Amino acid sequence: REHWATRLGLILAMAGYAVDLGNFLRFPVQAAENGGGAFMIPYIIAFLLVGIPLMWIEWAMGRYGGAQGHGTTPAIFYLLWRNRFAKILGVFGLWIPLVVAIYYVYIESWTLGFAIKFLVGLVPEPPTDPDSILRPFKEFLYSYIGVPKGDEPILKPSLFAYIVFLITMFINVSILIRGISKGIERFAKIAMPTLFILAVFLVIRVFLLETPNGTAADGLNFLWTPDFEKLKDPGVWIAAVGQIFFSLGLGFGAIITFASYVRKDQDIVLSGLTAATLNEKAEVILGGSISIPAAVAFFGVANAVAIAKAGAFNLGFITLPAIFSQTAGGTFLGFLWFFLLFFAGLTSSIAGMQPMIAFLEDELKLSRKHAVLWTAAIVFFSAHLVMFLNKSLDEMDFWAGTIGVVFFGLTELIIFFWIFGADKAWEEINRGGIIKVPRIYYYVMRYITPAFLAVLLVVWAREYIPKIMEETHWTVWITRFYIIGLFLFLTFLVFLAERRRNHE
Ligand SMILES: CCCCCCCCO[C@@H]1O[C@H](CO)[C@@H](O)[C@H](O)[C@H]1O
Ligand SMILES: CCCCCCCCO[C@@H]1O[C@H](CO)[C@@H](O)[C@H](O)[C@H]1O
Ligand SMILES: CN(C)C[C@@H](c1ccc(O)cc1)C1(O)CCCCC1
Ligand SMILES: CN(C)C[C@@H](c1ccc(O)cc1)C1(O)CCCCC1
Ligand code: NA
Ligand code: NA
């Protein structure tokens, strides 16, 4: 079996998986809307009671499976619980990251496209008033994506956007086809320092921003001034638990697959804790110092609330580029921003396609070349739905990227810590550990952590599902039909895998 060459490479590859666009775009928006500085209270608590425990568990499940030559949940769940229902549940740990990758690589291609356009100066150049500056950039993004101008739910991506997507798929393949150590690990050792350097430069350059409407200090002020009155709202606590779960990328099955390349008696306790801490530092220190302070420095603290409510996608692809065009060398500054987002996305997408690759290698005995190429073919083909059907991305992101991940994360807990055995699971986590997991975490993993996820799943299901099922355009069924078919296809592959094993 393939293995990570160094401990540093493993940690950077794991942190690289976690650190993405959400760190620099989603977190700052969530924090500003939920108490600002006071949001750090439930954020840390969620990190201690949910994020950290579940991550140790996914590392453990991965390493345990890897020792027996299996990197994906259909096989791994069966090893933890020899039941037919376990293999089926395990399909979700293959289905979720595949479906997400189908839309994420496209989003990733946007950042490369924008990076190129900004580097060469092929960007709008306004003109005054905020709407007069934002609108040319709004249209810039809309023309790139091909946002519907009529009543049809049809996207029409520019030829440039399509070609960049092809290039982006090529780059993902180039890294993945070289394997774990010479590909993913090797890239992580280059991408993470580059990511850190670009982020620091952007933080510094943002801090120097001075406009008649305000400064960057006003931005850090608005964002970090505690509003403890919001701590009463359970939605804030739900948002904190949600943000922690999303940022660490739990319940995607990607962590499990990566951990399956960790040697049997190699540490996962400290390595896991370190990777998680890196994502958090990158999230609160770097992510919280760029987008929001810049938006406040330029538009004034008077528009800070409106900016936060506008969303993370508006902030990263419209608002920030618009502000850049109004600063000295902002064209190059825009390049660095999207270059940053691209590498952050690329380190995440190579991780997200690895489970499907690992399934074909471990269970269907495909060579790495064939496994990578076929995985890329599935992703590339399926991505045309996201590229041409409006809101297809939103539907996939809800079922797989939102509801699915919390459900699967809870499924991981129950199978590992309740079915497989809490004592066996506890030993499996701490085995080979440089440091040992504090004894208190045994009860957290067994009672507290699943309780939090259960609440999160129930609340979101009652809140969002009726809306999605009743107030959406009929075209969502196109996306639903296709991704359900993808599940059936993966279920069939699991069936072929067990029939091949019975023969050999
Ligand atoms: C779900 C993926 C399907 C999207 C494929 C859309 C391809 C768009 O192709 C369309 O072909 C037509 C000719 O038949 C042309 O008239 C249109 O201009 C062209 O855009
Ligand atoms: C998810 C599906 C995305 C829809 C793809 C949009 C393509 C719309 O394109 C349509 O293609 C038809 C070709 O059969 C032509 O008859 C129409 O003239 C053309 O507008
Ligand atoms: C779970 N949600 C809702 C967040 C995702 C998203 C997807 C679609 C969308 O319209 C907004 C956010 C997101 O993860 C996709 C791009 C990276 C930042 C946000
Ligand atoms: C840890 N994060 C945030 C990255 C993940 C992700 C998940 C959802 C999403 O909307 C964006 C990225 C991702 O790595 C999951 C597997 C498929 C590629 C993206
Ligand atoms: Na993250
Ligand atoms: Na990443």
Side-chain angles (χ1 to χ4, degrees), residues 1-263 265-504:
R1 185 170 189 82
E2 301 180 75
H3 293 286
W4 304 99
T6 65
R7 173 159 290 149
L8 174 63
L10 164 66
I11 295 175
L12 294 184
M14 282 284 201
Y17 157 74
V19 176
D20 83 315
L21 283 70
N23 290 66
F24 303 92
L25 292 181
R26 183 156 221 279
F27 168 83
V29 171
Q30 295 295 323
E33 291 186 0
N34 299 276
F39 180 71
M40 288 295 100
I41 295 297
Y43 185 82
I44 291 170
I45 292 178
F47 180 71
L48 295 178
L49 297 183
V50 175
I52 287 301
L54 231 194
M55 185 224 52
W56 274 331
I57 287 178
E58 292 190 16
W59 278 70
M61 293 184 295
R63 184 182 63 169
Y64 176 85
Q68 299 178 69
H70 303 275
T72 58
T73 58
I76 292 181
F77 279 5
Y78 190 70
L79 294 177
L80 302 178
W81 178 29
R82 298 224 174 206
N83 190 287
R84 175 153 301 278
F85 188 54
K87 287 184 179 178
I88 302 179
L89 286 180
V91 177
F92 289 90
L94 207 57
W95 179 75
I96 294 172
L98 177 55
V99 171
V100 173
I102 289 164
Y103 69 82
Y104 191 71
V105 182
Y106 186 43
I107 296 179
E108 170 178 317
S109 69
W110 301 354
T111 63
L112 178 57
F114 273 69
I116 292 174
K117 297 287 276 295
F118 265 86
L119 179 56
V120 301
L122 293 179
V123 297
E125 297 170 29
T128 322
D129 287 329
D131 196 43
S132 181
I133 307 181
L134 287 173
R135 183 168 60 255
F137 283 84
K138 187 174 187 177
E139 294 170 350
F140 183 74
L141 175 61
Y142 282 18
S143 297
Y144 187 86
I145 308 309
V147 170
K149 295 175 249 60
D151 295 36
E152 312 277 53
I154 301 313
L155 295 163
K156 186 48 184 177
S158 62
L159 176 56
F160 180 71
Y162 190 87
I163 292 176
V164 172
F165 174 69
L166 278 172
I167 297 173
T168 302
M169 284 300 305
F170 175 81
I171 297 180
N172 280 263
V173 168
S174 294
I175 304 178
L176 291 172
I177 211 169
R178 281 167 175 79
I180 299 300
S181 66
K182 298 181 182 302
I184 302 179
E185 179 172 10
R186 180 175 179 267
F187 181 72
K189 284 186 171 181
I190 305 179
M192 296 306 282
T194 303
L195 215 58
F196 174 80
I197 291 177
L198 293 176
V200 167
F201 187 89
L202 290 173
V203 165
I204 297 179
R205 216 269 157 255
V206 156
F207 285 177
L208 290 174
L209 286 173
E210 289 180 318
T211 78
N213 304 322
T215 59
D218 297 338
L220 291 180
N221 180 84
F222 156 79
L223 183 56
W224 297 118
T225 39
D227 184 20
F228 294 103
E229 195 79 330
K230 292 228 62 180
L231 290 186
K232 291 177 182 172
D233 197 348
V236 171
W237 289 84
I238 264 61
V241 172
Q243 174 62 29
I244 285 289
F245 193 90
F246 287 143
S247 187
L248 292 178
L250 302 171
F252 281 93
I255 296 178
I256 292 181
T257 301
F258 265 14
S260 77
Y261 300 108
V262 175
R263 298 180 181 272
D265 298 323
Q266 182 181 346
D267 164 89
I268 59 179
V269 181
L270 181 59
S271 298
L273 184 61
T274 303
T277 303
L278 287 175
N279 173 84
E280 296 309 307
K281 290 181 178 179
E283 174 148 311
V284 318
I285 303 297
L286 301 181
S289 298
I290 302 177
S291 65
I292 290 303
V296 174
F298 193 85
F299 291 108
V301 73
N303 301 278
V305 176
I307 292 170
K309 292 183 176 299
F313 255 131
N314 278 15
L315 185 57
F317 289 88
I318 299 180
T319 308
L320 257 56
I323 295 177
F324 295 157
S325 65
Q326 303 297 110
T327 67
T331 264
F332 182 82
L333 212 285
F335 160 73
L336 294 181
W337 168 248
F338 288 111
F339 186 24
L340 174 73
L341 298 188
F342 173 68
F343 263 16
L346 178 51
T347 46
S348 290
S349 61
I350 60 180
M353 280 179 284
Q354 186 60 213
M356 183 59 187
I357 294 166
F359 174 80
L360 300 175
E361 291 175 348
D362 304 333
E363 321 298 333
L364 289 178
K365 305 307 178 184
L366 266 59
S367 69
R368 185 173 63 225
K369 180 179 66 178
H370 290 158
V372 166
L373 291 185
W374 272 115
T375 296
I378 297 176
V379 173
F380 171 70
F381 172 80
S382 304
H384 286 73
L385 189 63
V386 178
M387 293 190 295
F388 287 93
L389 183 59
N390 200 31
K391 304 305 185 185
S392 180
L393 180 148
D394 292 65
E395 189 75 10
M396 295 191 181
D397 177 79
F398 176 77
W399 295 109
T402 304
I403 290 297
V405 298
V406 181
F407 164 80
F408 188 69
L410 185 65
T411 299
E412 289 171 337
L413 267 161
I414 298 179
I415 291 189
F416 197 55
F417 243 83
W418 283 91
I419 301 183
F420 181 67
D423 285 22
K424 297 166 57 56
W426 181 259
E427 294 299 308
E428 191 57 40
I429 297 175
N430 291 276
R431 179 174 50 82
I434 299 174
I435 64 176
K436 299 304 175 181
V437 180
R439 198 168 180 89
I440 186 60
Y441 263 111
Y442 177 89
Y443 311 95
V444 173
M445 290 176 177
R446 194 179 187 184
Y447 301 104
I448 307 303
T449 307
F452 266 86
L453 294 190
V455 162
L456 185 60
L457 178 136
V458 169
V459 165
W460 279 355
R462 297 226 184 99
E463 174 187 0
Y464 294 113
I465 297 185
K467 310 293 186 303
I468 302 294
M469 298 302 292
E470 294 297 291
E471 252 72 41
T472 53
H473 193 254
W474 67 262
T475 51
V476 298
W477 283 107
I478 304 165
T479 298
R480 293 172 186 175
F481 181 70
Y482 187 76
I483 62 182
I484 286 174
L486 281 176
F487 188 95
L488 178 61
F489 162 73
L490 293 175
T491 294
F492 184 62
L493 291 192
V494 172
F495 172 85
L496 293 178
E498 52 183 23
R499 287 312 177 279
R500 188 208 62 85
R501 193 177 68 87
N502 292 339
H503 179 265
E504 63 91 7

